[PDB]
Amino acid sequence: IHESSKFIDQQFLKLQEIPELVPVGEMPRNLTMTCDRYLTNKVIPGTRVTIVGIYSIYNSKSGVAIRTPYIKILGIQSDVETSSIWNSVTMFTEEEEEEFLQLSRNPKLYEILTNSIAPSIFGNEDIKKAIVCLLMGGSKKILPDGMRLRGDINVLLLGDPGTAKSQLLKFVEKVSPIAVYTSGKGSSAAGLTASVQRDPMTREFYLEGGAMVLADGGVVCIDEFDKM
Amino acid sequence: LTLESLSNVKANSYSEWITQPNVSRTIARELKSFLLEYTDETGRSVYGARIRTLGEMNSESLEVNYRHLAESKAILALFLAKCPEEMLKIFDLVAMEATELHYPDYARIHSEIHVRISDFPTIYSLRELRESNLSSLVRVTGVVTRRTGVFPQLKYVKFNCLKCGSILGPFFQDSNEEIRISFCTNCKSKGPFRVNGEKTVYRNYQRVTLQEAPGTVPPGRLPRHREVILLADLVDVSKPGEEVEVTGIYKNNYDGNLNAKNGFPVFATIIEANSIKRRVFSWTEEEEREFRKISRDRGIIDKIISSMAPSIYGHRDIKTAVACSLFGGVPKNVNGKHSIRGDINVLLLGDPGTAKSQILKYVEKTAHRAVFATGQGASAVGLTASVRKDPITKEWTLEGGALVLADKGVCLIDEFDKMNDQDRTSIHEAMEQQSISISKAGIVTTLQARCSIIAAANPNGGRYNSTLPLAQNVSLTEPILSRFDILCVVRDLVDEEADERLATFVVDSHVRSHPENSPIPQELLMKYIHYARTKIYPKLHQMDMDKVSRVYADLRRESISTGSFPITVRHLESILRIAESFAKMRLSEFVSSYDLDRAIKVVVDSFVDAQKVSVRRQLRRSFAIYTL
Amino acid sequence: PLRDLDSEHVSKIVRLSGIIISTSVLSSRATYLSIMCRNCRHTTSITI
Amino acid sequence: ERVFQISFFNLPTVHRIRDIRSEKIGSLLSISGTVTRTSEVRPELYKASFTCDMCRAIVDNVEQSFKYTEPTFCPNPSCENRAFWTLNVTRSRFLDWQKVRIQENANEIPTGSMPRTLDVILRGDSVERAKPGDRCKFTGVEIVVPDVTQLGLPGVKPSSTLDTRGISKTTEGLRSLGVRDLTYKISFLACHVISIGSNIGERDQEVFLNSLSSDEINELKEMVKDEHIYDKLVRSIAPAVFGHEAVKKGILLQMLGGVHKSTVEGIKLRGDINICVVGDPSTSKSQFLKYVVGFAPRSVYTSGKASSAAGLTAAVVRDEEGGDYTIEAGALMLADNGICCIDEFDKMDISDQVAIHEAMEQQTISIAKAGIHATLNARTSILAAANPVGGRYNRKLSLRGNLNMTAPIMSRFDLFFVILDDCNEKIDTELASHIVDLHMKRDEAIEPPFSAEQLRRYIKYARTFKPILTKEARSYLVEKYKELRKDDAQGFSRSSYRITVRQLESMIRLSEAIARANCVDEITPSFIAEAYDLLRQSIIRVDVDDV
Numbered sequence A: 001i002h003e004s005s006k007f008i009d010q011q012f013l014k015l016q017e018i019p020e021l022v023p024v025g026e027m028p029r030n031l032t033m034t035c036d037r038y039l040t041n042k043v044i045p046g047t048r049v050t051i052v053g054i055y056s057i058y059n060s061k062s063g064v065a066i067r068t069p070y071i072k073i074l075g076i077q078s079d080v081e082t083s084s085i086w087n088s089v090t091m092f093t094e095e096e097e098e099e100f101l102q103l104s105r106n107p108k109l110y111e112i113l114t115n116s117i118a119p120s121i122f123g124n125e126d127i128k129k130a131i132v133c134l135l136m137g138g139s140k141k142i143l144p145d146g147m148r149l150r151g152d153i154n155v156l157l158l159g160d161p162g163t164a165k166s167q168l169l170k171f172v173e174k175v176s177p178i179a180v181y182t183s184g185k186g187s188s189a190a191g192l193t194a195s196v197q198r199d200p201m202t203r204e205f206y207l208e209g210g211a212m213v214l215a216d217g218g219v220v221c222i223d224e225f226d227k228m
Numbered sequence B: 001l002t003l004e005s006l007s008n009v010k011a012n013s014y015s016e017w018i019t020q021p022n023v024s025r026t027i028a029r030e031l032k033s034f035l036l037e038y039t040d041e042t043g044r045s046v047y048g049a050r051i052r053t054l055g056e057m058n059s060e061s062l063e064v065n066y067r068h069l070a071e072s073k074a075i076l077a078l079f080l081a082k083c084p085e086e087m088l089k090i091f092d093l094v095a096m097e098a099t100e101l102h103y104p105d106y107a108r109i110h111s112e113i114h115v116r117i118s119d120f121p122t123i124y125s126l127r128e129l130r131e132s133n134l135s136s137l138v139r140v141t142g143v144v145t146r147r148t149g150v151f152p153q154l155k156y157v158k159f160n161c162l163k164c165g166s167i168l169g170p171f172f173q174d175s176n177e178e179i180r181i182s183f184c185t186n187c188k189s190k191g192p193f194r195v196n197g198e199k200t201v202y203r204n205y206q207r208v209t210l211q212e213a214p215g216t217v218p219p220g221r222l223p224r225h226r227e228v229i230l231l232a233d234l235v236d237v238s239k240p241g242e243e244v245e246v247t248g249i250y251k252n253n254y255d256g257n258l259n260a261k262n263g264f265p266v267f268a269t270i271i272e273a274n275s276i277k278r279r280v281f282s283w284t285e286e287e288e289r290e291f292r293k294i295s296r297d298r299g300i301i302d303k304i305i306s307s308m309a310p311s312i313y314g315h316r317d318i319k320t321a322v323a324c325s326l327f328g329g330v331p332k333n334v335n336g337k338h339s340i341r342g343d344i345n346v347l348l349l350g351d352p353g354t355a356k357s358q359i360l361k362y363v364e365k366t367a368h369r370a371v372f373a374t375g376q377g378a379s380a381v382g383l384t385a386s387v388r389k390d391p392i393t394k395e396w397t398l399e400g401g402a403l404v405l406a407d408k409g410v411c412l413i414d415e416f417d418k419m420n421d422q423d424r425t426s427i428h429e430a431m432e433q434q435s436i437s438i439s440k441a442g443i444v445t446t447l448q449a450r451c452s453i454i455a456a457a458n459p460n461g462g463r464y465n466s467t468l469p470l471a472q473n474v475s476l477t478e479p480i481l482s483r484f485d486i487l488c489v490v491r492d493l494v495d496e497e498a499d500e501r502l503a504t505f506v507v508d509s510h511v512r513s514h515p516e517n518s519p520i521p522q523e524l525l526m527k528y529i530h531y532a533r534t535k536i537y538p539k540l541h542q543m544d545m546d547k548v549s550r551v552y553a554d555l556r557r558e559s560i561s562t563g564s565f566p567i568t569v570r571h572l573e574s575i576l577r578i579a580e581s582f583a584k585m586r587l588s589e590f591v592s593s594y595d596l597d598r599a600i601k602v603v604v605d606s607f608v609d610a611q612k613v614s615v616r617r618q619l620r621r622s623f624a625i626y627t628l
Numbered sequence C: 001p002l003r004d005l006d007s008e009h010v011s012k013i014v015r016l017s018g019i020i021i022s023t024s025v026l027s028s029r030a031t032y033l034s035i036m037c038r039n040c041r042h043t044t045s046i047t048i
Numbered sequence D: 001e002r003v004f005q006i007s008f009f010n011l012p013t014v015h016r017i018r019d020i021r022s023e024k025i026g027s028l029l030s031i032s033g034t035v036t037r038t039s040e041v042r043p044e045l046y047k048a049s050f051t052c053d054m055c056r057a058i059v060d061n062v063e064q065s066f067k068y069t070e071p072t073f074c075p076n077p078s079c080e081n082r083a084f085w086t087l088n089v090t091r092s093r094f095l096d097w098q099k100v101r102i103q104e105n106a107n108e109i110p111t112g113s114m115p116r117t118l119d120v121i122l123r124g125d126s127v128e129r130a131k132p133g134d135r136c137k138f139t140g141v142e143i144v145v146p147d148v149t150q151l152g153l154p155g156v157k158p159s160s161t162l163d164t165r166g167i168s169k170t171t172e173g174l175r176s177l178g179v180r181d182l183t184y185k186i187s188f189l190a191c192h193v194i195s196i197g198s199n200i201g202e203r204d205q206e207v208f209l210n211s212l213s214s215d216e217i218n219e220l221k222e223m224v225k226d227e228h229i230y231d232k233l234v235r236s237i238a239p240a241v242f243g244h245e246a247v248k249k250g251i252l253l254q255m256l257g258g259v260h261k262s263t264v265e266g267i268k269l270r271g272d273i274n275i276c277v278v279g280d281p282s283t284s285k286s287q288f289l290k291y292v293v294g295f296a297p298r299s300v301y302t303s304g305k306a307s308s309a310a311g312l313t314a315a316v317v318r319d320e321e322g323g324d325y326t327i328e329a330g331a332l333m334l335a336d337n338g339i340c341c342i343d344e345f346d347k348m349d350i351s352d353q354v355a356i357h358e359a360m361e362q363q364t365i366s367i368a369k370a371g372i373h374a375t376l377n378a379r380t381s382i383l384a385a386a387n388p389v390g391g392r393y394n395r396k397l398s399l400r401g402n403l404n405m406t407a408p409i410m411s412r413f414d415l416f417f418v419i420l421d422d423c424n425e426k427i428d429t430e431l432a433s434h435i436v437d438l439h440m441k442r443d444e445a446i447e448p449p450f451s452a453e454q455l456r457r458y459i460k461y462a463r464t465f466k467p468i469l470t471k472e473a474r475s476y477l478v479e480k481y482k483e484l485r486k487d488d489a490q491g492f493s494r495s496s497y498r499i500t501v502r503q504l505e506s507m508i509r510l511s512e513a514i515a516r517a518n519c520v521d522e523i524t525p526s527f528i529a530e531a532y533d534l535l536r537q538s539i540i541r542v543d544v545d546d547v
Ligand SMILES: Nc1ncnc2c1ncn2[C@@H]1O[C@H](COP(=O)(O)OP(=O)(O)OP(O)(O)=S)[C@@H](O)[C@H]1O
Pocket: A120, A121, A122, A123, A160, A161, A162, A163, A164, A165, A166, A167, A168, A223, A224, B479, B482, B568, B569, B570, B573
């Protein structure tokens, strides 16, 4: 009787070993994992995790008495947390609010925030001011006629090689709450802009990736902007 | 009974004779006697020492030489060779009792001792296995080609009854076929019983494809292959692509309804491995003090340069570059925000026939983690990370590529000039951020690619032009060219005496290689390089500031005067990084002034050799003080 | 490490690090289910 | 009790694969064909051992006739049931079993049809006497094998229904019968295998010399004893081709080859000699390759455009839509320790050129497709014929400019023979007379100093020798390389391609081949001088326009 029955959710995960430490002539090995209740939908594919769980057995219908191993997930810990819109947090503690307001009353806030931008890069103070203005951004608009005017700033840095432009890009990528560092032709296997491909399991259109959609509400640092 | 009575066989077959209880008791008694009082007439019992060693090392593997058992009890050797299964089981029981005699508590920790038969006299190749070798001990050489993951196989099977719930006693699972029970001994029923994996004991299982080594295959024939089954202690001992020699029982695999495609009752054969012998960067305290002793001498670095690529003659500068790349500097991250790369990238640009590929294979042999890739070829690991679906396994695999796979190692790229666009973008991302980002098939992540890169390239048109600079002599663009710290240009210029020495070297190597006929030893150098890479971590101090900053400003003005492509800050960074690698060659915690001068020399020599000859004539005279 | 998992770790708590390829869709399992006999009309509850 | 195999051979008539008919099923026959695939040696259940389930008592020596059978006699009187039995492979008896696939010979194929294969099965001592890539004559019995693929074919497929006429039945109640289809295909079960020559008509020297009789070994000794043996060998190669003595020398040295040396560090020095022939159209470049494939054993002939990457090296093929994948040897494997002849190497695309230079550099073929991983041997000399860009050979460009093939291809060819078409009266007159005389006189216009069979015998005798460099020969090699590089220095761009260390290694290989030609164990500086002369005349000068 389904109307009086209680159900929960269950998820299957597939975990591979770290591809950095794999023998060159071997396909990397993976394990199937089962989680349930509040352990489901806690991770996204691609993140690096530490799994506590029961190494256990199932028989799947190559050896007369052979069994396929799997992991009963009991807890999930994430080593690093990726930055996105849905992974962003907007709640703030009260002491952090007091500290942020106390910082803003400093009349030398412009100088400290320009000096804190890449302290290891000598010179280029106006570029550091540009970086601060880039990081703050402007006021977004929703006008009554429906057309919107953007508040985000675009800064181009072109010049001779060996002048810490790439280092400034890397620092902006490291300091931003959401940021993607990419080249003009994209990444090794991560495309630029927006890539719509078919789902590998259902053959249906979905947004696979791209630097400008993964970094919505953030900064894309595009090195080598000319080759594109 | 006696050994002479054991020689006479009363049953129809050997297995039926050995299965008899009094015969098996006689076999066990004689095996125990051989295990106890065998000596090599040197006053020492070797097998008691082996038992004590496996007891103190907490190992379940006992290595028993076949020649010792053959000279001691030859009838036991013949019996083991003809019917190895129950004999190996009996000798496992005998060895278990023997190690229980030395260690009374060894039963509760292991309860299983495996006997690994070594030095079997006859050696078979995989193509001469026949009907007579079935259910017998064979010894076959071969290359491990592919292997499966480690799986749990039932060993001490415990069942539960579905009526009363009682968990039944452990039943031993042989590797031949599945075991089953039909009686409960509690509720006296023949109904369904279920295996529970919580109380069942398991052993490790692996499948390894063994292929005939191509050097031993007959000319027109294909190399044969077999499936080798590896038990609990033999898993993960043979990596793919290596030559091993496996002893085991050559038995017949069972399949349901035989093979319908053939129309004949054709069986498949497997080799259950009893033992594996292979036909490591671990240093001891004696190795450490040897490293220190060979560290204090003054001219060790040149000796290190003398030890790189013994088969390559006369190319000293590129040997220095590869030696510096193999040792490397240290990567640093000042206050977390600003990261400085610590490994040297070397670009060997040369005309055909200058033995760059031989040096690349030397780095493959020497380095701890060397990953080889090529642009034009296909039978190699790619430089691009991907998420790929196996057509047969029907599972996804995330491959990091050669750059991710060579993390904290070295990546050896052959034919760097003719890569496609995707590999070029992967290479640029690998040298830019030392990371590779993937967004494919729902996987969005980044992978560390902290890999030193040694590349080999050919000039445009197949011949280097001295009048034209290096930028227009290659297909590489400026951003991918400037990331290399050392730009070693080798040209096969005509020289009478140099060709004389090169010809004599090559002809002598050819003569010494005929089958009818000061450098550091390599096996010490490999561990020396690993030790220096993983323990030294040099640091350079503050009063060496006044010289490198002086020479940088001195040479930037000369580069302006000659009108070449400019010297930027990364040239100073490469000078400092190569200087910190020269400190790791000496096993020194600090960078000396001589290391700084030598790094300045090698960077200046790399910079002036990439110039147009009109720039070169001015630059060699301008930088004569630092080149020396 | 994932390659060091042996048969001695079976039905034991292990800690292992790695990366995740795919997360499947959420299947629906039953915690409390009420059942009724087809003709006997006997009502029973199973809590799993 | 041992198994006795009766082998019949030397039948009066040898039939083709297409002459196999259904009236000869179960009869003694002798067929011939080219082996394309071979299987692993496997055990076949000959005398099975069975335990009855109720008896728990075993019976032995049960004859197995093709398909798997179980006896219903049950001589133990404990039970009353016959169908239920269990097979024990431990004490059962087996036989050797191999299934080799053969194909129609090239001359036996009809006018428009493709060759049809046949799975011929070898048992007992005849196993592994068949090798992929050679012509074999199989004597045996034409047997019949169950086939499932004939389900959808047109025509009335025969079936076997159980006859129910003498069975008493009652309509008590509480009508199924066992009927099976009889669909079959023709196979061959061979008892004797003999390998005829893949040509139109064992490394140690002692085992080869015991094979020959007294008259043939006397012929070999008198042929070796000749002081002009090298000139006879050169003029005896490709007698249909007029002129081109250098190409004949290169082909002879390619057939002889050099020794294979393995360095202590582990690298292997290549002993195979690769020849590339480039030049004007209608310069008899394909005639050399046709002669080599029709003369040299273990040689295959390939077209550049009709070839494929899987066809040249190795292919992974799926049979009957099953889970099993098999390896079929490519052209480089059927020519293992032989010569692979490739016309129109320029017409070959880039991917196949990459796949073939991988096997040229590594001497191996690596397979990772599907679930199959393997490393196969490809120790094969390559004889390639290529046309320049634009058809005509541009004299004003270099060798690399005229050829579109990649630099890894170019660096591994020891000899490049550029043949130029020049219109002179007496050469054209003699060539036309030779060609029309050939057309008029059939075989009478061909008069080589040595016949094909004795030439092959001399090649096989000479390949056993392993030449050794002497003390003066090394210095002569060094001086020859130095003066070749000095010639490059004084020529600058005038040389077609520059002498490098690879040319020194090719000089050593050619000297070893020449020392094999004269049947000696030590290399004489005269052989070094001849090899240097051949390699120097291989390279031609480029003409530059006057300024
Ligand atoms: N003013 C500077 N202060 C500190 N480090 C600097 C400075 N200028 C250059 N560098 C360093 O010099 C090296 C050159 O790298 P980058 O200048 O960041 O590359 P980039 O030339 O800006 O980008 P390109 O044009 O694509 S190579 C880096 O290690 C920088 O940290």
